[PDB]
Design a protein around this ligand. Sequence first.
Ligand SMILES: Nc1nc2c(ncn2[C@@H]2O[C@H](COP(=O)(O)OP(=O)(O)O)[C@@H](O)[C@H]2O)c(=O)[nH]1
Ligand SMILES: Nc1nc2c(ncn2[C@@H]2O[C@H](COP(=O)(O)OP(=O)(O)O)[C@@H](O)[C@H]2O)c(=O)[nH]1
Lengths: 154, 154
Amino acid sequence: MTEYKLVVVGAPGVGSALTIQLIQNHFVEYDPTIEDSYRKVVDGETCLLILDTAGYSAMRDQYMRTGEGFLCVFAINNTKSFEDHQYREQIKRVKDSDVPMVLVGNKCDLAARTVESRQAQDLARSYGIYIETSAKRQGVEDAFYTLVREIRQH
Amino acid sequence: MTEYKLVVVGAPGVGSALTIQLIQNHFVEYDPTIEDSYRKVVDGETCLLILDTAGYSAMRDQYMRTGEGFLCVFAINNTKSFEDHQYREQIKRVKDSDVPMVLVGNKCDLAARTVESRQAQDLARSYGIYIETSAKRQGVEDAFYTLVREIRQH
Ligand SMILES: Nc1nc2c(ncn2[C@@H]2O[C@H](COP(=O)(O)OP(=O)(O)O)[C@@H](O)[C@H]2O)c(=O)[nH]1
Ligand SMILES: Nc1nc2c(ncn2[C@@H]2O[C@H](COP(=O)(O)OP(=O)(O)O)[C@@H](O)[C@H]2O)c(=O)[nH]1
């Protein structure tokens, strides 16, 4: 089985849940984490489709060394969320690789966006590798299937 | 209006129609083309969402010079379809750019695939930029939204 041990680390209070509209495949109360992993589909590829982790003194710098995709997420709206890049360098520090990523911005149903989409998009244009999403279903597969896309290219 | 004058050129008898499950937004008899264009949504971006063209002595090498995305398609199954690369160089010859592309393979509902997905995937791994799809709805937005993705990066 062609598999893919990815992960996402993330900013303080936004969403386990994008993939919750997906492994288990619904929208769920319950705060997450510990490192709640689980394995589980076919663009024609044979994969085992995510290891969730909290919204880290040691431990973050432990369980992360066995990842091939930390395309973090934040709410595309929250004012310490892309701002929390702040989670990019340390993945580039753990697996000393200047790495399998994408800018996912959560939540554009609830109105307020300080983070104008096209604002974190210039952040994408230095990086080269963005997204907007919500479990309560579109676009979430999209992006982690997009994940599936650059790591074959890796 | 941030727009995107893309296009797709293509192999001999496969599908106008991926986007037909989309502009007009359904699955349609009717052979295509002439250069049947039409303009027409929001990952949070403001675009004008495709110029169809036939399944070319001059003319192909005419209307193509005003394109920013020819992520051709073929059926991921048909034995003169990725084989028809054969449509890659001439886009790299028109806009002398060694360019905004992706390997889209159509049709994996009807069984037979000679083109094993993971076969044209090594074709993707030289290229760096694949897909599998069907109008009769999933994945087609996916990929041309994926189109929307690399050309901001361009
Ligand atoms: N409005 C909105 N709520 C969402 C969306 N996706 C998930 N949720 C909510 O996200 C919340 C909190 O985040 P959590 O799951 O604890 O993530 P973490 O702290 O970053 O690990 C829960 O209240 C969910 O009900 C979304 O797209 N939109
Ligand atoms: N089985 C199948 N038929 C499709 C799919 N998408 C489109 N069609 C069919 O594609 C056919 C022929 O292609 P056409 O639209 O003429 O494309 P072009 O010659 O390459 O410009 C029509 O018979 C459609 O009904 C698909 O995903 N699966």
